[PDB]
Amino acid sequence: NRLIVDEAINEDNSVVSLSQPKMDELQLFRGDTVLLKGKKRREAVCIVLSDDTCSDEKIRMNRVVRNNLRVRLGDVISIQPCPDVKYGKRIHVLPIDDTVEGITGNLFEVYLKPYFLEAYRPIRKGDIFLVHGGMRAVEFKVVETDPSPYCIVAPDTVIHCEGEPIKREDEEESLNEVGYDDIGGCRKQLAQIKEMVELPLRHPALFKAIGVKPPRGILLYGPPGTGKTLIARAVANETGAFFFLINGPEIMSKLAGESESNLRKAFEEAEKNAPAIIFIDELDAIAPKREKTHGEVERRIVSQLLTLMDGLKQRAHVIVMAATNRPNSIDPALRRFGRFDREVDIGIPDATGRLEILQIHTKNMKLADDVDLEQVANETHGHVGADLAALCSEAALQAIRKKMDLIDLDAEVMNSLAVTMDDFRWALSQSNPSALRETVVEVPQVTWEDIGGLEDVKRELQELVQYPVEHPDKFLKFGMTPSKGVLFYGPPGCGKTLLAKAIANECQANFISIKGPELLTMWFGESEANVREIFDKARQAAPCVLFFDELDSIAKARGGNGAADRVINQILTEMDGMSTKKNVFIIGATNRPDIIDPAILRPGRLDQLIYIPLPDEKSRVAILKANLRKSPVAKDVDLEFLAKMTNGFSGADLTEICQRACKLAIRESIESEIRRERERDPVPEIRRDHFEEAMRFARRSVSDNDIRKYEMFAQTLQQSRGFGSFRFP
Template structure:
């Protein structure tokens, strides 16, 4: 297909958006046909993505709801590979791709030991573009990789016995031959190292927004309240307003409050400290308060940071209703630390509880936990998203109705 010169561009900038749940781990990006024509690419072609670093992905058509929008949908792994976050702009250009002669992979998680023939992993990565330092996912879900060869049963057994959740394995691309953007083909030699190696790249995201189903509104609110102040504090300084110091997540047990806090910490590339309320309490005088001070000090030294307090009602109950002196002292210490956050740098406290009315009222005032987000029970669409997330790494029957 030939495009007019006035339409063709060497590169374009598109705004990053989260991926569709079913696209996670597939190494694809979706953007409008108008921009595909400007770059001279078709679905199935490979584009180069440049943020803080360069990576590559396979082009697919935009979702019908996204037509005409200047967004590019990519999952958390590709965002990590490109060094961008949701809402950032990424430069997209047609990639110059070479066939990979050799690719060396290693487990992304430390402490994982694998003995896997490279041929088995290669079947799941055929056609995938990679760059040294990329994080990629191998999954046993795609049934088209079962080719009828004698290795099929071994391949199936390998993915069914994976030690990591949902039949997925995360690998870091340690090296490629040749350098640059390469595409894995049948002729590529894949070597899988048994253990993780040190690669000078960003941390591996454990939880991304695509791993959370049924909480679209809550994600939008927490991004505005937490991610924006951590990543762009200059906006609040320019406007002359105080960024939120604390956010309270409340809702029934098991709706995803803890998962939501982990995801926003990963997406904002912030230091994450998670504490459970009961872990703070101690019978020795002053020890509970000392633990709290140490946690806030660690957060200050590693800013930007997120302190997540689960079951906060256990350490900050209403002081007029408790008889123990320890609980009263801990509440007072927490109030003092929250008030001192302004001088502590970019630190935000997220707390979760299923009993918001049991909290001390002094915590729920401006300057402390003044922003509250309800994390409710998911509706029909939300439950469908959760099911898609939990089954995206499973080998499903071809006629399965998603």
């Protein structure tokens, strides 16, 4: 029954096309009573075998069951014979969308009777189909349920006329269609969600092959403001379980005694319905950490909830979901491994998450053929899905602000909207990032040739971190565990960040970066649990590269006013407690290497102290190629003479040279524009005079005596080499 679908021909459900060689291949029964299934657990019955307009192996369904049970045309249509049902007695007199557009009259003789050819509506008692005589766009929801199952009705008996109009909000209020594609790119963890709910997904048969279900209870972890309602509703209408969401403050609103009411009653009806997935929205209001809790009714409510968790009979795969802002925000008693044990992290969206988060919200509009949406995506750094939703909302609001108050609804801007790149950029300026000051869990872009360096020096790192991930049998045959962390040092190490980012680029592993002031915040805030929470979320962010920038920031802070401190001891506590597996790797940057810790050079912690020197004239070609990328520098530039002139400058200094040449070019371009306007083609090409004047803004920021200090530190790196290379066998 898994086969391709034909395009639309007519607009009536009372006529349905037919593919007769495919019915010759299959086994389908007569006419009016044939079941079709699909999305949102929606069983539907209508007619087949009636028109025979199209060809074989593709059959036309009506448009109201094109939008329902599937997503669009070209999907997989399925058929099922559901015969020998009984006869009903005059289903609905009540339509639900367009009663007021017209006249009521007899309320069922007006629209049903001119638009049928003895098709007596075998549709679900509560399902929709557009039916009217003239305008032909009136849906219905059936309230007359004289037969219980999917049945046709007897011809023209008599019923009441109690049909009243309602706004058409019920289908997206109670049976809102969501799928895997309807969440904006969470497939790092949506695959994990699908793995966790697959044994609840109509499967009792593999329960004896699983023992106990690993979903005893699933916690969703995400930032405050990302929303978890549609994420928790994704397993609804894809599994077909009874959803029955209850809000935390909804439980907290009602009084005690009634607080247990509609809380244990939800679980009591969850054994009444065999497929059941329960979700608690914002359980942190119900269950905070106990130190912030107060009174007795809140403790009694969380006691009732925990007895509901422990009272699970482990039957009918009844699963409870929850919405956590932070795992430390909830009570630690709920993290015991008998219930609510499996934690899955939504996280923040990345640039590509921002890219394919936006077409879902911009389905119901029309672009001005100018937004490529890549220039909308990565400029919204530290945003979230609510940020993009509000961004599209006030971008449309700005487009309406561009429209003057001349309205006949006319349909010149609302029917064809013109939110331009300028409109989206003005919207992007007026933003409010709730995901600001949140560490990204994503793979950045450097890709290994932004800085030249010495490639063999990075190739021991290539052996160190990439190949244990790629080869599990790398050290298994003849060896032991490799180095857990490598720290680099020397100059101001912006290039060390580039090397760590490109190392994360090769593995496509996560890049968690902690700054020097970020650690000094925990140093002066006297809250040592934040670093433990960072490492705990880095455990769940595996595989990842943990970058610490400016480890000697605490040394420079204590130099103004004992080398060991409170935050570096927690670092040693977690990293000595870090496992020999799971491929968590540490990258360190440090301006002054010898003064931070005498215990950091002990083996067991880390041993590699790979120094990189000052960048020289070989890498200046690479930095000038990075200048060539993303910037329209012209020809007739002497990069070999520029690298000749850079006697002792840094990579940060040469990017500052790029910045001064940029300043000269933009100021002479706007000066040319100003004299062009004063006279009564911006010339993006850049000439040798820009670099020749930017060379006057070039001073060696690194100290010349500090290179002598660096090779004095490398005298410790200078080994005890000498005679003794006797024999290899």
